[PDB]
Design a protein around this nucleic acid. Sequence first.
DNA 1: ATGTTGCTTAGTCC
DNA 2: GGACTAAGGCAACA
Length: 219
Amino acid sequence: MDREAFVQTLTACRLCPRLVAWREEVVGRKRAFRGEPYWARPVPGFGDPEARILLFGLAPGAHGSNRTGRPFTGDASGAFLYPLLHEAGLSSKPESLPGDDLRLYGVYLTAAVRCAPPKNKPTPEELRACARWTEVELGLLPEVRVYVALGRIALEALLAHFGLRKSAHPFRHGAHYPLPGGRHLLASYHVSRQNTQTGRLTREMFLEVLMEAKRLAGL
DNA sequence: ATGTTGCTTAGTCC
DNA sequence: GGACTAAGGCAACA
Ligand code: SF4
Ligand SMILES: O=P([O-])(O)O
Ligand SMILES: O=P([O-])(O)O
């Protein structure tokens, strides 16, 4: 299917009952946003359909993409990620605001699961269900040369996608594995506030990942 | 009030 | 693999 068909069918998806409930249950639970409209639906990917670099996250944040409708938009993860994308020359401007004119250059963003999960922890079954959408979405990204897994969950999801074994591809920040057709699989700590504010992942470390992805992508 | 909640990793143990 | 949790720093939240 094409992208219009993808977005159309993805947004009406309700295969995971626990997530279909959670994505709406969190609406109004955060003080700063009570009374405001929430997307509270599956989140479609965002970015350059001709991207050579794919940044693969974990899932929607309850008050992040689940609220704004755009990956990494409206929370601490995006406040960290978007400025770095611009600093690396991969976007039109530093901030991402729903409904704005932000453009990504050579990069596309999406995640393993597309509906906000309790505790930011989808079950093995929810991962298997949404993996069908990963097949469709990545199927619509023909130019990707570098797949960047943001976190352990994201990597394991990509490994499953590429039919690779966990034992031969452990998760460690900076890890780089070869893929068929001269492509690449890179692993990075996730951009979560839990990682960036605690010091496990710094702005310097992540910009480095982005620069390396550009290098391996011929950008 | 100032204590709690909430935003992955890495290791334990079965 | 699966279930569990200490640790990490900060600040909205209550
Ligand atoms: S997580 Fe994915 S598969 Fe499950 S309901 Fe949401 S879009 Fe559908
Ligand atoms: O809502 P996310 O894309 O920041 O997880
Ligand atoms: O932000 P608070 O401290 O007024 O609740």
